[PDB]
Design a protein around this nucleic acid. Structure first.
Ligand SMILES: Nc1nc2c(ncn2[C@@H]2O[C@H](COP(=O)(O)OP(=O)(O)OP(=O)(O)O)[C@@H](O)[C@H]2O)c(=O)[nH]1
Ligand SMILES: Nc1ncnc2c1ncn2[C@@H]1O[C@H](COP(=O)(O)OP(=O)(O)OP(=O)(O)O)C[C@H]1O
Ligand SMILES: [Mg+2]
Ligand SMILES: [Zn+2]
Lengths: 122, 86, 97, 99, 50, 76, 89, 34, 48, 166
RNA sequence: UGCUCGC
């Protein structure tokens, strides 16, 4: 039951949303009585996590959009955590990048923020 | 005949003899202070090799600011055999 | 038990075990001498190799490395008697794979 | 009579009987005749499956008195054994779940 | 055996695997010859030879 | 491929035992039994019909192994 | 061949059996139980379960007989299934 | 009491050299083996 | 919420490592110290 | 959210042999790792994929099918600086009780870093004015069995401004 | 523990 690596690869909320939708549809297409009665925590966690993701703006996303966003942010020398947070949150306001996003000092430059907003809104 | 005991003997039996108090003087205090100074100064010595930290969570811009820097002594490879070169 | 008046069972002697070995029936020998006679489930600690109780090791004062194990009861009695004789058997468990 | 020779290499087991032998040529060489009395005592645990369900139902209905039958029922969910000499055996046979 | 009062034991396996191993390896039809020299032991006896 | 192509009696006994234990635990039948309430008889029928879904993993003493199907082996 | 496989004719007695075999449990079970057990405890000799006698004692299937090989299930499967691609990485 | 039906008709009836305290109503084996 | 712990593992014993125990290990393994030479109580119940 | 590589010995009973092996393996792994927190790993959500699946043995014991399966599963484990958006599912005098939406009621922010108008008078009063943001700080796990929870984490709410809500 | 038996 040992784990090989707990930090193998960070993934955004879109992959989790797609996985939850696929698992939900495969479950509703292959619903089993005894398998469900054995453990009902699976259905609960899946449904509640899917609902939480639906409450977020994580919808209207596609792998092509994620790849375009990554290629756009690769020119800004930002770290993986910053772009991950920007993709998961999808900031529409600048103040979210100004104060909430860490490593603000010497990174905003007061000119790159407009480009970041234009990229995240596209 | 010896009597029976209901409870086991105490884990730390008492003794009527106590340890002699330590020697006093400027010499003992100076040696104590010097031993404390050696304890404090030998851990920061490059000979004190610490356990190499591993499994970094992420890379960050603050890495260069928090990067631990310490001078490393160069062993004399003439006296040391060849098998210990990096 | 031994006798019929004591409602005893028939004994598989050493020569019967030899015959079962010669036949090569490992599962039948296992069922006869372990499953049907003195089967028991003990708790062994994977750290010190000693026998625990109720999923707990009193020696190490922990319960993370304690695991269940099927064993003949006579084998557990032998292990306990050997521990009484200062001949401590330390069992290094491992996965069946 | 030590542990190794008397309790490890050779030990006593249950589900066994001992009886005097008598000749019977009308049986095949791979067959052996067992008395009804010993057959009612030595029991075999059969698992309820989709094949022998209707046979085990009749065996339970017969009970521990008729020779073709059973003596105990162990449920799949709970491991509490049930004696067939007491209780309604028909209700037990009608409630024979797989496993 | 000689049927002059000999008592014999009869064991019932409690496992399907053990039952199958007993029937296959220790079957009467599969052990008609001894492994010592291959001679058949299960054969005709008195009142069958005569 | 270097071992004997004939299926030994020990392999037969173990395969029949495992198949009977599985069938007794509500395993699917592949020979369409006809009133056989004994799992060992069903296992023998599957062996004679060569429909047992079990692959023997013969291990060499050094550590090497090889897989042989029941239908691939020769029965007597 | 068993008596003459170590280069010296070793008998079936306890001495030859000890010189041939290595399993502590079998040596203890055959003869000289206490002496062999105390000697093993002194040497700290770890005894495996490769032999038949220790397999019988510990209640595990012996390596000889039907237990020499292992069985595999011919289940409908697909080794190395297709992996879901990672979009963020 | 019986663990299944809750009855108090627990009788000690030995069945072929097997001591067994069993419920007399539903036949549930309460305890067995001595 | 709930911590994941394994219920049962199919553990198989590999080998038995014989050895000896120090008096400290004997104290650590044991639960109680036996100091009374008698077996039962003086009362008629004869409790240990 | 992050992927974790695990290797598990899954036992499938014989009455599931008609089913596909990979589907039943995934179902069993999901049933075994649902709503559970692995120590020093985090709360696992579900199975992401199955990378390696080797041969399926059958033991001389139970007789079921034992398969060693290598898989990757998604878990919830911040990187000590991640930003989250939760909802206030209660409040205590020593600290508010914020819960990620239907995810886990384990986030306990200490009220010791906001502007000096911080207090909770047991009337569910959040903060005196001048979707709740969260900055995870440290992870912490603990055991359960110690005789014959496990994930709380600390939450920071700095002077973020919050032009939308004070 | 002893002993008489049963092959
Ligand atoms: N003199 C004598 N000694 C006996 C008797 N029964 C047992 N022993 C001794 O006890 C040892 C064997 O004990 P067991 O026969 O196993 O005792 P047990 O039958 O388990 O005793 P219970 O548990 O009371 O049935 C032998 O070494 C004998 O010396 C007896 O009837 N007379
Ligand atoms: N001490 C013993 N050990 C093993 N088997 C024994 C023992 N005593 C009797 N038996 C059993 O009884 C059988 C002995 O019979 P056997 O010696 O062949 O005929 P018999 O007793 O000489 O009869 P006759 O005197 O020839 O009429 C063989 C054996 O299985
Ligand atoms: Mg005779
Ligand atoms: Zn321990």
């Amino acid at each position: 039951m040992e784990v090989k690596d707990a930090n193998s690869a960070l993934l955004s909320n879109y992959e989790v949303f797609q996985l939850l939708t696929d698992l939900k549809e495969q479950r509703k297409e292959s619903g089993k009585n005894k398998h469900s009665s054995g453990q009902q925590n699976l259905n609960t966690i899946t449904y509640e996590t899917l609902k939480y993701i639906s409450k977020t703006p994580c919808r209207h996303q596609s792998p092509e959009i994620v790849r375009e966003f990554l290629t756009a942010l690769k020119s800004h020398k930002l770290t993986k955590a910053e772009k991950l947070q920007l993709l998961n949150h999808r900031p529409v306001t600048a103040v979210e990048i100004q104060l909430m996003v860490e490593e603000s000092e010497e990174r905003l430059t007061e000119e790159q923020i407009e480009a970041l907003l234009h990229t995240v809104t596209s | 005949l010896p009597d029976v005991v209901l409870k086991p003997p105490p884990l730390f039996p008492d003794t009527d003899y106590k340890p002699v108090p330590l020697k006093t003087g400027e010499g003992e205090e100076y040696m104590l202070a010097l031993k404390q100074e050696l304890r404090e100064t030998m851990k920061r010595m490059p000979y004190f090799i610490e356990t190499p930290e591993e499994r970094q969570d992420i890379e960050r811009y603050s890495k260069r600011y928090m990067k631990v820097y310490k001078e490393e002594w160069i062993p004399d490879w003439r006296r040391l055999p060849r098998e210990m070169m990096p | 038990t031994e006798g019929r008046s004591r409602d005893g069972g028939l004994r598989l002697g050493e020569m019967e075990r030899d015959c079962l070995i010669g036949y090569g029936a490992s599962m039948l020998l296992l069922e006869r001498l372990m499953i049907s006679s003195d089967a028991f489930e003990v708790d062994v600690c994977g750290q010190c190799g000693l026998l625990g109780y109720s999923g707990w090791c009193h020696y190490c004062k922990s319960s993370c490395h304690v695991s269940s194990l099927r064993i003949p009861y006579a084998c557990k009695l032998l292990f306990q008697e050997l521990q009484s004789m200062n001949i401590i058997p330390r069992l290094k468990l491992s996965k069946y794979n | 009579q030590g542990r190794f020779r008397g309790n490890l290499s050779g030990k006593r087991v249950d589900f066994s009987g001992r009886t005097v032998i008598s000749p019977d040529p009308n049986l095949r060489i791979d067959e052996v005749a067992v008395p009804v009395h010993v057959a009612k005592i030595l029991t075999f645990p059969e698992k309820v499956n989709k094949a022998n369900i209707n046979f085990l139902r009749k065996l339970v209905q017969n009970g521990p008195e008729v020779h073709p039958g059973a003596n105990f029922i162990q449920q799949r969910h709970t491991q509490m054994k049930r004696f067939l000499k007491y209780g309604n055996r028909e209700k037990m046979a009608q409630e024979l779940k797989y496993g | 055996a000689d049927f002059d009062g000999d008592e014999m034991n009869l064991h019932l396996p409690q496992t399907e695997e053990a039952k199958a191993e007993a029937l296959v390896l220790m079957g009467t039809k599969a052990n008609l010859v001894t492994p010592r020299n291959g001679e058949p032991l299960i054969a005709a006896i008195q009142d069958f030879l005569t | 491929r270097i071992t004997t192509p004939y299926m030994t009696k020990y392999e037969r006994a173990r395969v029949l035992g495992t198949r009977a234990l599985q069938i007794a635990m509500c395993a699917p039948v592949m020979v369409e039994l006809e009133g056989e309430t004994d799992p060992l008889l069903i296992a023998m029928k599957e062996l004679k019909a060569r429909k047992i879904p079990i692959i023997i993993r013969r291990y060499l003493p050094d550590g090497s192994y090889e897989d042989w199907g029941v239908d691939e082996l020769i029965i007597t | 061949d068993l008596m003459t496989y170590k280069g010296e004719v070793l008998g079936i007695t306890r001495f030859g059996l000890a010189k041939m075999k290595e399993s502590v449990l079998m040596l203890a079970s055959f003869e000289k139980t206490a002496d062999h057990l105390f000697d093993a405890a002194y040497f700290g000799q770890k005894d495996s379960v490769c032999g038949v006698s220790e397999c019988i004692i510990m209640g595990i299937p012996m390596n000889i007989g039907t237990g020499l090989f292992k069985l595999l299930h011919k289940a409908d499967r697909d080794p190395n299934p297709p992996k879901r691609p990672l979009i963020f990485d | 009491r019986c663990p299944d039906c809750g009855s108090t008709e627990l009788v000690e009836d030995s069945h072929y050299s097997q001591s067994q305290l069993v419920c007399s109503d539903c036949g549930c084996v309460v305890t067995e083996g001595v | 919420k709930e911590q994941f712990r394994e219920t049962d593992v199919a553990k198989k014993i590999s080998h038995i490592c014989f050895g000896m125990k120090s008096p400290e290990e004997m104290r650590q393994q044991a639960h109680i110290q036996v100091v009374s030479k008698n077996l039962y109580s003086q009362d008629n119940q004869h409790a240990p | 959210f992050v992927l974790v590589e695990m290797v598990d010995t899954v036992r499938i009973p014989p009455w599931q042999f008609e089913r596909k092996l990979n589907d039943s393996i995934a179902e069993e792994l999901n049933k075994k790792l649902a709503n559970k927190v692995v120590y020093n790993v985090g709360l696992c959500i579900c199975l992401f994929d199955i990378t390696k699946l080797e041969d399926a043995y059958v033991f001389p014991g139970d007789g079921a099918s034992h398969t060693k399966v290598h898989f990757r599963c998604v878990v919830f484990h911040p990187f000590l600086d991640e930003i989250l958006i939760g909802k206030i599912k209660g409040c205590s005098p020593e600290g508010v009780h914020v819960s990620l939406g239907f995810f886990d009621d384990i986030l306990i922010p200490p009220e010791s870093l906001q502007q000096p108008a911080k207090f909770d008078e047991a009337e569910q009063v959040w903060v005196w004015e001048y979707g709740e943001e969260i900055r995870f700080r440290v992870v912490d796990e603990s055991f359960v069995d110690t005789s014959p929870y496990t994930l709380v984490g600390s939450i920071s709410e700095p002077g973020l401004g919050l032009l939308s809500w004070w």
